[PDB]
Design a protein around this ligand. Structure first.
Ligand SMILES: [Zn+2]
Length: 59
């Protein structure tokens, strides 16, 4: 990705949580949502959810 999309990490909304995107949390790709496994908070997906390499290849 030389001179390309840098991409930024997606940290949970909650400050105390700020848990990175892990395969443990319930990612509702259908409802464009993802529930946390710790704070258990529903966060909406970002407008630029492209760069994110993790997302690109959903496990
Ligand atoms: Zn959380």
């Amino acid at each position: 990705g030389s001179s390309g999309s840098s991409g930024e990490p997606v940290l949970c909304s909650r400050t105390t949580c700020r848990a990175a995107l892990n395969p443990l949390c319930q990612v509702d790709y259908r409802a464009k949502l993802w529930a946390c496994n710790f704070c258990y908070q529903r966060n909406q997906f970002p407008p630029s959810y492209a760069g994110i390499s993790e997302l690109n290849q959903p496990a």
